[PDB]
Amino acid sequence: FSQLLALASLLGQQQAEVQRCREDLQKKESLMMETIAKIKALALEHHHH
Amino acid sequence: FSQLLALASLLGQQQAEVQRCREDLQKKESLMMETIAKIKALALEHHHH
Amino acid sequence: FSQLLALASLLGQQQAEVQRCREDLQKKESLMMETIAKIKALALEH
Amino acid sequence: FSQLLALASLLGQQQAEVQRCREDLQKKESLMMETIAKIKALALEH
Numbered sequence: 329f330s331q332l333l334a335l336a337s338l339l340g341q342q343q344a345e346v347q348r349c350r351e352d353l354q355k356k357e358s359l360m361m362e363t364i365a366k367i368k369a370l371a372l373e374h375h376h377h
Numbered sequence: 378f379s380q381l382l383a384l385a386s387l388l389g390q391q392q393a394e395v396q397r398c399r400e401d402l403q404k405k406e407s408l409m410m411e412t413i414a415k416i417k418a419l420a421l422e423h424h425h426h
Numbered sequence: 427f428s429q430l431l432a433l434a435s436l437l438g439q440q441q442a443e444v445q446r447c448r449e450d451l452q453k454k455e456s457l458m459m460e461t462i463a464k465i466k467a468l469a470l471e472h
Numbered sequence: 473f474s475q476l477l478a479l480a481s482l483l484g485q486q487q488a489e490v491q492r493c494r495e496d497l498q499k500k501e502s503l504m505m506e507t508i509a510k511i512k513a514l515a516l517e518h
Contacts, residue, residue, distance in 0.1 A: 329424065332420045333424050336420040343458055356440065364437065364504070367437065371381045371511055372381075394500055412479050412483045413458070416465065416476060419476045
């Protein structure tokens with residue numbers, strides 16, 4: 329049908345993949361901080377002996 | 378006291394600001410998609426007349 | 427200090443994985459905006 | 473098409489705001505890693 333359909337369908341398909349990578353990223357970023365938090369806790373538990 | 382304290386305190390202070398910007402960002406990104414979703418819904422509601 | 431040096435090596439790999447996925451997300455957002463430009467250009471002719 | 477062109481202009485501003493905040497987050501992560509390097513270097517001497 330209209331050219332709108334094609335674009336709006338492409339847009340909906342591309343936003344699905346943007347939101348897909350954005351949640352996978354937020355998972356990878358969350359694990360990064362968890363490791364950073366363990367590092368900081370270890371240097372604290374070490375200075376405190 | 379030890380140099381660990383200074384670094385581990387700096388680290389904890391810098392991770393606080395990293396996690397601060399990361400949540401503000403996730404708020405700005407979430408609003409972006411909401412606008413994109415409204416755009417796509419409008420081109421669909423238009424082709425469908 | 428066995429554990430800290432190990433988490434340091436793991437942290438490097440995750441940061442790279444994050445930087446990689448951050449790069450891909452940029453390319454996908456850029457593709458999405460181009461479709462929105464083609465939508466905007468269409469809406470300007472009405 | 474009154475509304476769509478308006479959301480298009482708003483979308484541009486938000487994307488810039490997002491790109492700006494994305495840039496700042498990178499500078500802060502880079503500062504955080506440098507402190508972790510100074511921690512790693514210390515842990516290597518033990």
